[PDB]
Amino acid sequence: SNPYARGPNPTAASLEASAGPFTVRSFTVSRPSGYGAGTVYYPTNAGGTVGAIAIVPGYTARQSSIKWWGPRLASHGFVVITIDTNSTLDQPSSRSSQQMAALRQVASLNGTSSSPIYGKVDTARMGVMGWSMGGGGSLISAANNPSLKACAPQAPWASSTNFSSVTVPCLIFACENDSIAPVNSSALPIYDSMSRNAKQFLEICGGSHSCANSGNSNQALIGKKGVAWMKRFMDNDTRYSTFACENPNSTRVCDFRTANCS
């Protein structure tokens, strides 16, 4: 039996829905430790400890850009922290440091009896996500901390596209018509550099740079894939192997690639 399996058996419908099975609550971090600000989303009734995911915005951007992931992932059995960086103009390495500081604080709060997330987190199972330079920061976090169980950046940008060292399972969401971090020069080269991990490349048809952000028109597919990836790799949950590894066969997807997945 898998000690990390949570919730009922998944379906395409249950993964495409607005919400998963668990009730979600949230709170603002009162004293952010090593980053600007944070919101923690958590399930109240997951039926066991769950992994934690830290999500970082892009250059100039704030939590509003990636907020939708908080309730979406938390409702399937994860503690999710969305952050604002110390400066909106922080670069990817700094974003990575702040992302890891946010994971550290979630672990701190797991051991703080006054916190709503006291005893709710398995601090040995963590994941990283983010938009643009925050996506680059997620890849840097994965390269520097290989015990991370999953990485799912969106429209990533980084100073170097070479992430050949990354052993962490990586799902790259890409936006076809991205003019800030073009697919051909950012997301795709990053994907191609990784030969030591489970990896996936999912490009959204007609998507601008913000195609996986809050308010996007593809929350059914993007949310299904993000949750499935985190479930498969953070929870070792093989009930999600097909959802995580499959080509969605969706008219919303203009390019799909996967390796070492199923």
DSSP 103-167: HHHHHHHHT-TTSTTTTTEEEEEEEEEEETHHHHHHHHHHHH-TT--EEEEES---S----TT--
Give 193: exposed, middle or buried? Use CB within 10 Å, 0-12, 13-18, 19+. middle
Resolution (A): 1.6
126 vs 213: CA distance, rounded Å: 21
CA distances from 129 to 2, 35, 119 (A): 24, 16, 23
Any idea what the Cα angle at residue 78 is, between residues 121 and 96, rounded to 5°?
85
Any idea what the Cα angle at residue 178 is, between residues 174 and 184, rounded to 5°?
65
Binding residues: 59, 133, 157
* β-bridge mates for residue 25, sequence order: 42
DSSP code for 9: P
Residue type, 152: A
Residue type, 179: S
Residues closing a segment before a gap in the chain (C–N exceeding 2.5 Å):
none
Which residues are annotated as catalytic? 132, 178, 209
Residue type, 250: S
23 vs 42: CA distance, rounded Å: 8
Q: What are phi and psi of 190, to 5 degrees?
A: -60, -50
Q: What is the CATH number of domain 40-259?
A: 3.40.50.1820
> 81-112 as b/e, with b when 16 or more CB fall inside 10 Å?
bbbbbbeeebebbbbbbbbbbbbbbbbebbee
From first CA to last CA, the distance across the chain in angstroms is: 20
* β-bridge mates for residue 128, sequence order: 54, 151
Binding residues for poly(ethylene terephthalate): 59, 133, 157
Sign of the CA dihedral 30, 35, 41, 42? negative
Please, how many CA atoms are within 13 Å of residue 125, restricted to the half-sphere of its CB? 20
